Amino acid sequence: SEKYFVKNGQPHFLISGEVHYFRINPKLWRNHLQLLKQTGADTVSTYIPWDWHEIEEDDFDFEGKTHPARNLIRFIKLCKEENLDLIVKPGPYILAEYENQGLPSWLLKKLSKNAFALDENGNVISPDLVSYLSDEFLEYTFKWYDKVMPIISKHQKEHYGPITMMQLCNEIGVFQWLSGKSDYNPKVINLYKEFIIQRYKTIEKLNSVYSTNYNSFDDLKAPSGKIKLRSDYCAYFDFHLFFREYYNKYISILKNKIRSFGINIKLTHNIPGWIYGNASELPMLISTYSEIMKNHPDIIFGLDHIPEFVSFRNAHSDLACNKILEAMQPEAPVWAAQFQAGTREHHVKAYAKDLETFYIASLAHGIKGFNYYMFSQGINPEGKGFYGKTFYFQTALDAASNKLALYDSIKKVNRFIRKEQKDLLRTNVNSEICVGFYKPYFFTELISSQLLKEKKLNVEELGLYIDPRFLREEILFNGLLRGLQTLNYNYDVVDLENCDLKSLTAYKQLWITSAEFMDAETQNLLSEFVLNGGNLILYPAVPTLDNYLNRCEILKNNFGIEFITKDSSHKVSAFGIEDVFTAFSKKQIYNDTNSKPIAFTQENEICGIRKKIGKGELTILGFAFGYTSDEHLELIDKLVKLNKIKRELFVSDKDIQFVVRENNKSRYIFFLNYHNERKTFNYRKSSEKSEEISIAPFSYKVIKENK
Amino acid sequence: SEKYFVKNGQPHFLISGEVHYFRINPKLWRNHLQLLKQTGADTVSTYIPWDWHEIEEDDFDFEGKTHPARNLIRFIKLCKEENLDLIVKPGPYILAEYENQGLPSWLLKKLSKNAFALDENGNVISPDLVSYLSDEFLEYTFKWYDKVMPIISKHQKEHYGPITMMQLCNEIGVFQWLSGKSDYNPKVINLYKEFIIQRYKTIEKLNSVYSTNYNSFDDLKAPSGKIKLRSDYCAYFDFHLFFREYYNKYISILKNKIRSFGINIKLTHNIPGWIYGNASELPMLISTYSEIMKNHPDIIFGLDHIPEFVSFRNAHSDLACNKILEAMQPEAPVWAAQFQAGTREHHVKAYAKDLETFYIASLAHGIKGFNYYMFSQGINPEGKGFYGKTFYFQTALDAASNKLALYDSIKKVNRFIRKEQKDLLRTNVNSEICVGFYKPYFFTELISSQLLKEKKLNVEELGLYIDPRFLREEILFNGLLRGLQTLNYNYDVVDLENCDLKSLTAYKQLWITSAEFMDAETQNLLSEFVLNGGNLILYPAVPTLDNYLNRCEILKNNFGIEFITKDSSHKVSAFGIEDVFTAFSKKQIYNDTNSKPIAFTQENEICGIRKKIGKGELTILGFAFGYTSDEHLELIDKLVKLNKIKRELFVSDKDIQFVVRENNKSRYIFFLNYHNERKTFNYRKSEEISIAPFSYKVIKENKLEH
Ligand SMILES: OC[C@H]1O[C@@H](O[C@@H]2[C@@H](O)[C@H](O)[C@@H](CO)O[C@H]2O)[C@H](O)[C@@H](O)[C@@H]1O
Ligand SMILES: [Ca+2]
Ligand SMILES: [Ca+2]
Ligand SMILES: [Ca+2]
Ligand SMILES: [Ca+2]
């Protein structure tokens, strides 16, 4: 059952608003807090910028002695007086469109070149981009923590202060992503060499996996440049594995330091990945936290949602992100550390009537808490803005604390949440579909991404044809997940790593989007799933290689599949649907042994089959489709109906999205119109005269039923 | 002064709908045409696919002998019976999501390897991609023309047929754009060599310009791979010039063959470039047609507008494109050969209420005619779709001629246009701002584009810091042009090539977005402009190089400018605006003798000046800004107000966009709400109105005689 925040042994919907004390006239701090409280928010959230408080090396001001807005201590006391809990975020990085991402100018001037993140040629990637594990960086970070952490410790909830949560640093790795370049600092390269020796033990074992001919570990260099050989792909794959251990070591060092101050509050981190109003790359960024989330059950990750608009063009991003966070972090609530309010960019408008729908859609899509970012506009003091004087536009409050149009939208959404939170937080959706999350397909931020400058991964040079980024973006994120949401079929996402078979068994169908490679553990898990009675849908490929592109045919043999890869027209027929456009000329052509052929190439060769195996069912399609045609939705619909899965409602307009959330007491129907059309429609429960609804463009309705 | 289509000696708003007979049940051809006519549309437009009609080599069906939807003759007859003019588009390429882009399968099977576009290794780029000047391709094209062109000729309006216009081929060069790959067919490379020999005359002259080390023209190889040296940049620059001449040679061969059949109707071509609902790349595609537009005053280019949605996210794209086409094609009306109706992509919705506002915005932004693409949905016959069974979604009519939501929107907009066309077509905007179009910055489709994944141009490798695509997309298209439209300042665009000094004197300001390179002819033109009394705004660089990156400091010397390039904070102050975020660390720091400093680095070095030169005024900014902050709109506004330029209206809500269009007698005020907010505002000349989200209002004002 559901994960949710709890206050006083009852479900609590975390409603926070971001208010930057350092960007607001301190004579107006109280008015901002009062107006936030009056929306029904229970929490306020702020960065504590290292640059703002360590005004010169070893010169600290938290009391407003050198600038009134340096009076952190007073802001904390005002939070307590106005009955708001406080989330504090002291960095060292805050980003936050603050000069030098929040690092002091004096620090970046003073640090040696080996404090910085370095490219393949030894050059500084960016004058504000440190190497996370630089000894110099960590020494200064610790001296900053020595001053700000005693203040945070004294003002924690357990000492009757307002502070309930603290974020460690900010969006770890967001610059290795954005800058479009990875850190070849020698501290990093030496840690990588240690990681490889620990992983492989002998150069002979490494040479056997990579198919390389090194005489010693001293001959192994950090991979750089384009992947041309499978041995380059192997080296980069382990480099990805290493960076996940690297970020875990960084956050582990910050956490150990923080705990030494008697800070026992909840620790948080925040997930980047939205850009241009979609989040198809966020799954790659959350995959960079795989080792933190396994090692730190006490650090809760939240999402940084930046939709910019709310339409069918991005409707699927927030649900797919909320589902993937749940998959990687199943023991904590799904929540947004930064939940768009106003816009960071003047030229990229944020309409109250878009964001209001986003807020309701987020509830439909399972969000359990959020921090409106930004609730309050700021004015950068003293030239501190990265890109201009004003921080955010079209917020709930302007910097002067005037109510703007979003204020009433947030009050309306908060009112509904506070009325309903006791039941709403306990509601589930009935998912009969599970979609597999295979993390290794996402481990490409060094070699293949939307932000990366040079494409380093070209699978055709490795004798492959299914690119893992193309598969996870277009076949999974924009394809299957977009398709299921559009068709109003509930799905859950499961992390396949150390996945318990007992968790998969509750679903009517398990859907796996597969490349030509998949590890032995996952091939074995899916084999057992089907033999024991599971129903598996697998496309576009039966894998035949492992994560190092060495032979592994476990699943192919356990399923009694024979296939050859042949070129044909992109168009196939599947389940009687003609002219299904597929992504590749190459297809898997299956022997029809003990199977029903259900998809055919233009030469009528078999490119999909259905089989019974043990107590289970297998459907394999040897071709790739996402959602770029109507035939693709017809095909997803056909596949779902193979196990007689039904939608919760009959709705007369197929372009209306709904979510039914229920517990024992209560049912919530969320209707979402992601289209620029006033829609009049009727619906009824699949279970047992119809109700008529009119919905405005880009709008929502919520119906509560008492059961 | 305005350019517009004419019918019966009066202004005529060309309203066409695209209806693909080859994709529609012939029993329903008359129904589609009657419903199109009933919207007030006057013209219908279609491809005539070569693959569809030459069913096997030298076997032609135009009469539905082998499939009823091959009855082209009957469709043409129906157009006439239903009182519609017809636009025909017989290729040879049609694209149109048709298998093999409209070329016959039997042709692609039969052609020799030397008929195909080849990569630098001599490998076929794509089995459906021919070399445009292949002898074998033009031979088979001519044999297609020998059968379809006598039918088109017989059905011209001249012979009380319906045919009024014909498109030659389709988006010439589009495949080099989409792939980032040039045709290295030896026949193309031979024509390139001839182009280079013709241009430079001797290997010594080419070596002096390129700084190459060739002993003869025999050493010369077509450029390929990344640009590492200034000499590679030179070679690639001329390779782009060559492709513009090559496309002109191709369309000239088609044109002359067409004219040989007594076809005297108006000839057209079409311009692509919209990507994900914005058009910042479309100017690059306009630039590929520079030589066609110079040499064929009688071929009318129309735009392929694909906005997908209508909001502030893309509001500036259509105006910037319409203005640039006007600059390049001043003697023809700006029109949309493909004007979005429905969506090519099922997952990319096209809402009737969005497109209705796009159609009215298009009128505000000077469009004189359009062809709804697609008015009618199609079903691909017997697997001949590139993609699935269906061609377009959310159209005016489905393939079965069912009316869809867009139908009533088109009928409403068409009623307005017909009511107003006689006056509306003769209106212009009063532009006091002129923005220079310098085509060489756009000549990059083989080395730097939004569609080219692996960038071949990296200007830092050449000792430069201002990339021409960054300049033209972010500083010009999404920056200055977006800013002026947002601020409701009218602008015009002028082609700086062979530009008449007398045309520039009409304007109060000329804005030049300059890289470190600019040819001598443009440097001299801008020198004379200011010296004779013009007011020039120039940023982010005084250029010091020509198009071949050789020294050329004519403008710098004529204006008494001296500068050092120095690194500083991205933020500057300009005209007392603090914290103006600029694109580059590197800025020009100007000597201020005989000058007024008006912009400063964080350390107070002078990165902008104003000065008097002869009778005119110069404003130089040594930094790059587009529109990514409110300070950028503040800076554009202050720059415009240096020469006392005023908006036509005071409108109380700054986020309402307006366009005042007038002639001697008539004024139209177009109000455009690109925002998801009901807005109430008032207006007066330099009075109270409510506009729905993503909507519009048009007010008419009669002008009083004096
Ligand atoms: O949309 C891409 C990502 O953008 C980040 O915003 C950064 C901002 O944090 C930073 O202060 C400025 C200046 O360096 O650059 C922006 O691009 C967001 O934090 C991410 O959530 C987002 O995915
Ligand atoms: Ca001090
Ligand atoms: Ca030389
Ligand atoms: Ca005009
Ligand atoms: Ca001077």
Author numbering:
A (entry chain A): 6 to 693, 698 to 716
B (entry chain B): 6 to 691, 700 to 719
Study authors write:
The IALB_1185 protein, which is encoded in the gene cluster for endo-β-1,2-glucanase homologs in the genome of Ignavibacterium album, is a glycoside hydrolase family (GH) 35 protein. We propose that IALB_1185 be redefined β-1,2-glucooligosaccharide:d-glucoside β-d-glucosyltransferase as a systematic name and β-1,2-glucosyltransferase as an accepted name.
Importantly, as shown later, electron density fitting ligands was not observed at subsite −1 at all. The distance is smaller than the normally allowed one (2.4 Å), as shown as overlapped spheres. This observation suggests that binding at subsites −1 and +2 competes mildly through Glu102.
